[PDB]
Design an enzyme around this catalytic site. Structure first.
Site, PDB file in Angstrom:
ATOM      1  CG  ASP A 156     -28.084  -1.997  -4.970  1.00 21.51           C
ATOM      2  OD1 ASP A 156     -28.387  -0.874  -5.431  1.00 21.51           O
ATOM      3  OD2 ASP A 156     -27.018  -2.605  -5.250  1.00 21.51           O
ATOM      4  CD  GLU A 214     -26.841   5.783  -8.352  1.00 21.68           C
ATOM      5  OE1 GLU A 214     -25.877   6.079  -7.605  1.00 21.68           O
ATOM      6  OE2 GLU A 214     -26.765   4.900  -9.229  1.00 21.68           O
ATOM      7  CG  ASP A 254     -27.568   0.712  -9.533  1.00 20.68           C
ATOM      8  OD1 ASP A 254     -26.770  -0.074  -8.992  1.00 20.68           O
ATOM      9  OD2 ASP A 254     -27.297   1.913  -9.753  1.00 20.68           O
ATOM     10  CG  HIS A 296     -21.295   6.731 -10.885  1.00 17.47           C
ATOM     11  ND1 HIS A 296     -20.892   5.787  -9.964  1.00 17.47           N
ATOM     12  CD2 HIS A 296     -20.231   6.947 -11.694  1.00 17.47           C
ATOM     13  CE1 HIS A 296     -19.634   5.457 -10.197  1.00 17.47           C
ATOM     14  NE2 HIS A 296     -19.210   6.145 -11.242  1.00 17.47           N
ATOM     15  CG  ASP A 308     -25.369   2.546 -12.708  1.00 12.56           C
ATOM     16  OD1 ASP A 308     -24.637   2.810 -13.684  1.00 12.56           O
ATOM     17  OD2 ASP A 308     -25.178   3.030 -11.572  1.00 12.56           O
TER      18      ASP A 308
END
Ligand SMILES: Nc1ncnc2c1ncn2[C@@H]1O[C@H](COP(=O)(O)O)[C@@H](O)[C@H]1O
Ligand SMILES: [Mn+2]
Ligand SMILES: [Mn+2]
Length: 200
Positions: free
Chosen positions: A114, A17, A15, A172, A177
């Site tokens: 992603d 960011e 995941d 987040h 996550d």
């Protein structure tokens, strides 16, 4: 059944960011690169890759991005850029034994963004080739929809709601996550679901 045999020896939960802003920054750049290696049968976490990444095009994180992700400037300052992180990933894969052709593994993400948008988009921008293990994956929302017979509305939070699971960590956060994705997977497998590649 419960915890049936699966088609993969390991699941790699991922995941990203990225840099962001209101309205959206362009282009976005990966700033957090987490991978959880899950035992393919039991879904237990066996290893973790986690690196923050220094963005280059927009090196100063916006206040929105920090508020959203919790990632502050000192976490990305001094870090390697995506190119080096991708080579760290490849070494981590090798040491985990995942580059063995007879060891079957697959990435798992919440949605397609992603690996369908973010990583190929930044790699093309950077002129980097995308490693082939990044090109197949499981969209957890799509697998959940097959397992539960319904389409979740707001990703992880709604999937945790339908499965009556308490959220893990900070929303987040990339690594948190990943842990929630891992926790949802364990429950889907407990209920007898067999995971399958969803990417096209
Ligand atoms: N509400 C939002 N507003 C703007 N950008 C967002 C928002 N949610 C997620 N993003 C961007 O998408 C990335 C992935 O977040 P997520 O898909 O929620 O794990 C974030 O690191 C941000 O760059
Ligand atoms: Mn995400
Ligand atoms: Mn996230």
């Amino acid at each position: 059944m419960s915890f049936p045999p699966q088609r993969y020896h390991y699941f790699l939960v991922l995941d990203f960011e990225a840099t962001c802003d209101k309205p959206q920054i362009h282009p976005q750049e990966i700033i957090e690169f987490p991978i959880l290696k899950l035992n393919g049968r039991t879904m237990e976490i066996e290893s973790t890759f986690h690196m923050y990444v220094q963005p280059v095009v927009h090196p100063q994180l916006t206040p929105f991005c920090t508020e959203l992700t919790g990632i502050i400037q000192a976490m990305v300052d001094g870090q390697p850029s995506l190119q080096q992180v991708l080579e760290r990933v490849d070494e981590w894969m090798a040491k985990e034994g995942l580059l063995d052709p007879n060891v079957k593994s697959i990435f798992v993400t919440c949605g397609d963004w992603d690996l369908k948008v973010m990583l190929p988009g930044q790699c093309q921008y950077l002129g980097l080739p995308v490693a082939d293990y990044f090109k197949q994956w499981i969209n957890l929302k799509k697998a959940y929809s097959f397992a539960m017979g319904c389409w979740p509305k707001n990703g992880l939070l709604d999937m945790n709601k339908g499965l009556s699971l308490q959220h893990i960590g900070r929303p987040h956060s990339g690594i948190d996550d990943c842990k929630n994705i891992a926790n949802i997977m364990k429950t889907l497998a407990y209920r007898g679901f067999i995971f399958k590649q969803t990417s096209k």
